[PDB]
């Protein structure tokens, strides 16, 4: 549904994963930062699109980026 | 309350107000309604004659109406009101 | 000029002076002549008569409504309507703009530059509010020396 993209400006601060309320983001190993980890979005079909990860990203400009695309019953947040 | 043997009973698929009574009428009342409402069954057929029959029945009494039945077919019954500037 | 009679010879402007005192004279009829609210209306009438004798003596132009109209084109007769108090204004408004600009330069080279804007340093402020008196000689002086404007390589620019 929603497309969440991680860019190489990430410092591995992990707070995009901690702010995620639908378990989209996970921290995979990486070689481009001091923390040696970058975020990724394997369960991007579960993304509501709330951009809590973009609110918690301290990198200017943002490393996690959520693009609101086709919206399904996962990304609409319904219970009915 | 999760079972893995009955998936409908653990998810809310309940007939909350349903009944399993097979019949409560008699054969004389049942044969009258299916005979009369037998040409009204098919959705594609019923949508055809309701649109075509509904367009005719509003154009009939729209046109055969009288002055007392509807005021738009009565017309004016007094002198017209002249506007300002002689118009 | 522009089809407007002068207000000293305008019959409509003298009509508005007549019907303004008459409104205030009828307000005076229900008070005692030595009472305190009657002294306020008597001071209002003398304020009105001072106003109408000031508007006619400045060469104001009155239309068909009996009202003084301002000519802002830059006429040699009409300098005090727009040009003279505009140059008085822009001197005062440039004084506000020069002492607020010079305060920000004086607090940008400080230890905590953001605490000097919520808490304005009055000895730093009052020593340049006096310096805003001669500001056209200091604004064009900074314009000619290049200190008024900042080069675009050191200015935060949003991307295309």
């Amino acid at each position: 549904a929603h497309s969440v993209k991680i860019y190489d400006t990430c410092i591995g601060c992990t707070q995009c994963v901690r702010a995620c309320p639908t378990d989209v983001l996970e921290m995979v190993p990486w070689d481009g930062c001091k923390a040696s980890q970058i975020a990724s979005a394997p369960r991007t079909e579960d993304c509501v699109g709330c951009k809590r990860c973009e609110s918690a990203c301290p990198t200017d400009f943002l490393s996690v980026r959520v693009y609101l695309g086709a919206e399904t019953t996962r990304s609409m947040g319904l219970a009915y | 309350y999760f079972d893995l043997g009955e998936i409908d009973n653990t998810t809310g698929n309940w007939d909350l107000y349903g009944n399993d009574d097979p019949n409560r009428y008699n054969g004389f009342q049942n044969k009258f309604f299916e005979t009369f409402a037998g040409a009204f069954t098919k959705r594609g057929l019923l949508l055809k004659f309701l649109v075509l029959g509904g367009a005719t029945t509003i154009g009939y009494l729209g046109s055969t109406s009288s002055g007392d039945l509807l005021a738009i077919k009565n017309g004016p019954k007094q002198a017209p009101i002249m506007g300002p500037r002689g118009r | 000029v522009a089809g407007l009679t002068p207000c000293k010879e305008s019959k409509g402007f003298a009509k508005r002076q007549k019907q303004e005192i008459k409104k205030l004279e009828g307000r005076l009829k229900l008070y005692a002549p030595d009472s305190a609210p009657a002294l306020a209306i008597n001071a209002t009438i003398e304020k009105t008569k001072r106003r109408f004798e000031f508007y006619g003596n400045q060469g104001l132009l009155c239309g068909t409504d009996g009202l003084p109209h301002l000519i802002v084109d830059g006429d040699q007769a009409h300098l005090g309507e727009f040009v003279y108090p505009g140059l008085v204004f822009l001197y005062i408004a440039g004084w506000i703009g020069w002492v607020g600009r010079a305060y920000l330069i004086d607090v940008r080279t400080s230890k905590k530059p953001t605490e000097k804007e919520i808490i304005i340093d009055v000895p730093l402020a009052l020593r340049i509010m006096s310096k805003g008196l001669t500001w056209p000689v200091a604004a064009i002086g900074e314009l000619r020396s290049g200190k008024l404007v900042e080069k675009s390589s050191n200015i935060t620019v949003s991307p295309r």
Binding site: - | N9, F33, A37, T41, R43, L46, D68 | -
Partner: protein, 160 residues
């Protein structure tokens, strides 16, 4: 002690309140023509039509525009029968959209208890087909019988 969860399950969005699972209310709601799961859906659709057909003559003969004439029986009954024919087409296009020809039944097969019942045939393409014709014949006869008992026989009532 009085309020229970819905069939003992607290995580289904409902409660077993007295307005829901009374001895009198759950007897009532289980005999209403919409919740008979084994009756053929044309027969129980005639009762859903007779009811709604009858009741709708009332607000159309006592409140409509032609309520102050001698044609108030004829104007309001055909207005009541007009709402039957519109809602029949609303019932027609609902069954076309919701149910496809040859599909299963979108109905809960399980009852309040754990016993397995047959699927409700009303939520099908052919079950809602016979339900729509049951509402059309029942609704047009429910309007006409309420018109007969009010403006043909003219039974005495306080308001008519």
């Amino acid at each position: 002690q009085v309020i229970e969860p819905l069939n003992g399950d607290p995580f289904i969005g409902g409660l077993e309140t007295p307005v829901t699972s009374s001895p009198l209310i759950a007897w009532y709601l289980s005999n209403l023509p919409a919740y008979r799961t084994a009756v053929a859906p044309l027969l129980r659709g005639v009762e859903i039509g007779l009811a709604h057909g009858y009741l709708l003559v009332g607000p159309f003969v006592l409140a409509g525009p032609l309520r102050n004439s001698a044609v108030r029986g004829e104007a309001g009954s055909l207005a009541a029968a007009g709402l039957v024919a519109i809602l029949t087409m609303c019932l027609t296009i609902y069954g076309i959209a919701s149910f496809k020809e040859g599909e299963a039944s979108k109905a809960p097969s399980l009852t309040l208890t754990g016993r397995q019942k047959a699927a409700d045939k009303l939520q099908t393409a052919e079950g809602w087909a016979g339900f729509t014709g049951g509402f059309f014949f029942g609704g047009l006869s429910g309007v006409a019988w309420a018109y007969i008992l009010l403006y043909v026989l003219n039974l005495p009532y306080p308001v008519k």
